């Protein structure tokens, strides 16, 4: 019952370089994270 939640294969593996573009820092996602981080910085400055 409980174990079904953790079924995703990535919970225990370490991605390998040989596989290819397995980096967890893909630009497609880093673009949004940077924008959100910039947003938080501006909010802090306004508060500060």
């Amino acid at each position: 019952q409980i174990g079904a939640v953790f079924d995703d294969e990535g919970i225990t593996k370490c991605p390998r370089v040989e596989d290819g573009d397995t980096s967890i820092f893909g630009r497609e996602i880093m673009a949004e994270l940077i924008k959100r981080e910039k947003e938080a910085w501006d909010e802090e400055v306004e508060e500060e």
Binding site: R16, V17, S23
Partner: protein, 215 residues
């Protein structure tokens, strides 16, 4: 992965690194289980880059409050201060404050569109006869930091200081504009009020530049 079987190689670099960097790397060690080799290298290098940049910026701000006005004299002061405190390879924070900046610090890390970069971590005047060029030094030339590169060569080749040069530039400009911008060759010679070749060379430079026209 991560080449943890190289005891000699991994340790030596840890020894070479400084104290502050060692603590930071030791603090981020556990997360290697989730990232591949390259990502871990990028992750660590970024932390080192930020730490060194903070040190350099703090270092420079201290200099400007002491009235130090050149990167060369700043290093001289640090050496004498080290001797004074004693009286009483270069690190990352020392390579950023060098007279020449590293190549990898002459471009944005993340471009305008917000996507991080993939690799995150001339008219020559002839030498006038009997003219010996003199080197121009920041301590000698007060307003050197404004002259354009195409004009600084002329000043050395002509043995004239910056501030006098600007004054000569102004008067010639004023005389030309009053008369539609056209002047005779003797007109430029008399205005300069120096040797004939000097006045001839500066005038020939202006006309080529396009700020005046020869009648």
């Amino acid at each position: 992965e991560h080449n943890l079987l190289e005891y000699r190689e991994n340790t030596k670099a840890e020894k070479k690194r400084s104290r502050e960097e060692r603590e930071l790397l030791n603090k981020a060690k556990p997360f290697a289980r989730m990232m591949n080799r390259h990502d871990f290298e990028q992750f660590c290098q970024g932390l080192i880059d930020e730490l060194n940049l903070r040190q350099a910026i703090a270092q420079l701000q201290e200099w400007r409050s002491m009235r130090i006005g050149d990167l060369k004299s700043g290093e001289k002061y640090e050496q004498e201060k080290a001797l004074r405190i004693q009286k009483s390879p270069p690190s990352g924070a020392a390579l950023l404050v060098a007279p020449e900046l590293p190549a990898r610090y002459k471009e944005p890390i993340i471009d305008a569109n917000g996507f991080p970069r993939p690799d995150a971590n001339k008219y020559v005047p002839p030498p006038v006869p009997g003219v010996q060029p003199m080197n121009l030094t920041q301590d000698n030339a007060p307003d050197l930091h404004l002259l354009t590169p195409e004009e600084i060569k002329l000043c050395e080749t002509l043995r004239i200081q910056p501030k006098p040069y600007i004054m000569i530039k102004e008067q010639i400009l004023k005389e030309a504009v009053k008369g539609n911008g056209s002047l005779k060759k003797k007109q430029a010679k008399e205005i300069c009020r120096l040797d004939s070749q000097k006045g001839g060379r500066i005038f020939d430079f202006m006309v080529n530049a396009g700020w005046v026209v020869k009648a």
